[PDB]
RNA sequence: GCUUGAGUCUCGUAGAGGGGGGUAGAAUUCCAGGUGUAGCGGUGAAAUGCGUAGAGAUCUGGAGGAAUACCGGUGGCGAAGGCGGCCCCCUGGACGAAGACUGACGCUCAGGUGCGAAAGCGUGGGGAGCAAACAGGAUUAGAUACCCUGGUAGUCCACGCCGUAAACGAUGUCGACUUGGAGGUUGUGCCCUUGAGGCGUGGCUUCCGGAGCUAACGCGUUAAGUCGACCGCCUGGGGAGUACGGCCGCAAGGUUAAAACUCAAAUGAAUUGACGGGGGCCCGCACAAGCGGUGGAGCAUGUGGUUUAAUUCGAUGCAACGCG
């Protein structure tokens, strides 16, 4: 990244719904190279999400993830010998990457039984935008809203 | 109240703070707003953003007068001033004149020493 | 110093103050009376203006 | 005696040359008043400070002091220090054009005399801004500083003193000769002035360079080149431009000016490198963007230490510490 501008590698889409978005979601959730376990958790959790909300699968996922995507985020500069937290507009791939990282991280924070219930309840708490990942999004937006004076 | 319908926006941009005072053509102030009185104390009260929200807030608080035309008089340098007049024609004012009235001495008083920072 | 315009106007476009007052003349009169640094600042300004 | 040195006269030119007097416009501060309202100011961030007893902002009127934006220019003038609005008065010098006059009247100069930034001193005024001292706030390990908020002498005027500066082109004065180029500034002559031209001829000045000189760097017709006249000064570093004495000074101090002792260097310019909280360009899981660890727990293993009869020896920033 000093010199090398890069490409990006193409991920295989989801084997049940053909969604590369949800494929990157099972990669964000995966730990220790265990992908089967993570896709089992995602299929169970989103299956009970589709059963609970009654909408469908990945539009319930797409709504619950649409409520947690950040708009702008702070970022350090260190240009004039000072520490500024400037607000900067998030790229779309980074936008939903941060969305999924906050959903998964907040779901790991929860205190329910199984991971499919922690993440199904976290996506359900994000569908009416009252969970923890929405508090992370509102927190990011308070930081970039307080420091709006730098652009 | 009193229904003046034309005023002057004296904007006083300095390096640390911009202070916008909307008055009439006689010179009697009708309401003011500073960048430091709009939140963002400190390194953030001298920015174009702070000056524009100062000017938005000074456009409010003169609704009681029905000002439509105004001249703009600009003092001092500053990160403000330019953005400041923008905020004024983002607040429905018909901006008539833009004069820059920075006080320049004709080699008058001795300026202070300073700044071996 | 003044500007005005009739109803075809959109932008400020007052670059009369990148002509005279703002950039140099007020930032110059913020700091010390020398007699000494200006003689050398002007000496090296006119010694830099060379081909 | 003579005119090619020096000087006088005639006519103009440019100029922040000097001294005295007056005036003008912007701006800062203060005072009085109107509007108006919650901050202003300040900083890297803050706080001290000012502010609902109404600040800051804004308008009107007044007072006062200092300095004189733009023009403004390696532009000008002055012996040097230095001199910057505009106007008047008194006054010094320079330069140019043609002609006339005196006729070597010249050059330098120890002692001597004068002028001599700034700070400082004396007496009397003045005092807006700025600001040693000083005070407070910060910063910091400390901060008798840098930064912030105030702030007295001083800076300004009159007269006297001081008598120095990196008072520097670190280059004494006067004169003569020795290839060039580009400018600036101020005169003057000639030619269709056929315009903001062309050709010369002086004065002052800036940059670059030739020969030559120079340790080199550089100087280079304004010499640090080639010569002549007279003056000033130098003789290793420190001690020391100090002590004692003299002269000067109100004082601060100034000037003239040693020795003992001590070192074998001190110095100049340039070269190679290294370094820089100098500059430009560029790279690496270097940072950033992420994911997983270590430091916490138990154990394994190595080391330091301690113990021991011995706890064999070696490895110890990175690049020793389950290493030999």
UniProtKB/Swiss-Prot annotation, chain A:
Source organism superkingdom: Bacteria
**Species lineage, top-down?**
Bacteria, Pseudomonadati, Pseudomonadota, Gammaproteobacteria, Enterobacterales
UniProt miscellaneous comment: The strain K12 sequence is shown.
Q: What does the annotation say about its assembly with partners?
A: Part of the 30S ribosomal subunit. Contacts proteins S9 and S11. Cross-links to IF3 and the P and E site tRNAs.
According to its UniProt entry, what is the function of this protein?
A: One of the primary rRNA binding proteins, it binds directly to 16S rRNA where it nucleates assembly of the head domain of the 30S subunit. Is located at the subunit interface close to the decoding center, where it has been shown to contact mRNA. Has been shown to contact tRNA in both the P and E sites; it probably blocks exit of the E site tRNA. Protein S7 is also a translational repressor protein; it regulates the expression of the str operon members to different degrees by binding to its mRNA.
Span covered, complete protein:
2 to 152 of 179
Keyword check for Ribonucleoprotein, yes or no: yes
What is the protein's given name?
A: Small ribosomal subunit protein uS7
Keyword entries, A-Z: Ribonucleoprotein, Ribosomal protein, RNA-binding, rRNA-binding, tRNA-binding
GO BP annotations, alphabetical order = cytoplasmic translation; negative regulation of translation; ribosomal small subunit assembly; translation
GO terms for CC? cytoplasm; cytosol; cytosolic small ribosomal subunit; membrane; ribosome
Q: Which GO terms describe its molecular function?
A: mRNA binding; rRNA binding; structural constituent of ribosome; tRNA binding
Indicate the family of this protein. Belongs to the universal ribosomal protein uS7 family.
UniProtKB/Swiss-Prot annotation, chain B:
Q: Which InterPro entries match?
A: Ribosomal_uS11, Ribosomal_uS11_bac-type, Ribosomal_uS11_CS, Ribosomal_uS11_sf
What is the protein's quaternary organization? Part of the 30S ribosomal subunit. Interacts with proteins uS7 and bS18. Cross-links to IF-3. In stalled ribosomes contacts ribosome rescue factor SmrB.
Q: What is the lineage of its organism?
A: Bacteria, Pseudomonadati, Pseudomonadota, Gammaproteobacteria, Enterobacterales
Instruction: Extract the GO molecular function terms from the UniProt entry.
Output: small ribosomal subunit rRNA binding; structural constituent of ribosome
What Gene3D superfamilies would the database entry show? Answer: Ribosomal protein S11
Q: Whose protein is this, by species?
A: Escherichia coli (strain K12)
Indicate what this protein is called per its UniProt record.
Small ribosomal subunit protein uS11
UniProt keyword terms in alphabetical order: Methylation, Ribonucleoprotein, Ribosomal protein, RNA-binding, rRNA-binding
Q: What does this protein do?
A: Located on the platform of the 30S subunit, it bridges several disparate RNA helices of the 16S rRNA. Forms part of the Shine-Dalgarno cleft in the 70S ribosome.
Swiss-Prot record, chain C:
Biased amino acid composition, Basic residues: 43-51
Q: Does the keyword Transcription regulation apply?
A: no
Q: What is this protein called?
A: Small ribosomal subunit protein bS21
Role played: Probbly involved in recognition of ribosome rescue factor SmrB in stalled/collided disomes; fusion of protein fragments to its N-terminus decreases ribosome rescue in the presence of SmrB.
What are the recorded GO MF terms, alphabetically?
Answer: rRNA binding; structural constituent of ribosome
- Record's family? Belongs to the bacterial ribosomal protein bS21 family.
Shown portion of the whole protein? 4 to 54 of 71
Task: Look up the coiled coil feature and give its residue ranges.
Answer: none
Name the UniProt key words of this record, in alphabetical order.
Answer: Ribonucleoprotein, Ribosomal protein, RNA-binding, rRNA-binding
Q: Cite a GO CC annotation.
A: cytosol
Cysteines engaged in disulfide bonds, as pairs: none
Q: Name one GO biological process term.
A: cytoplasmic translation
Note the subunit structure. Part of the 30S ribosomal subunit. In stalled ribosomes contacts ribosome rescue factor SmrB.
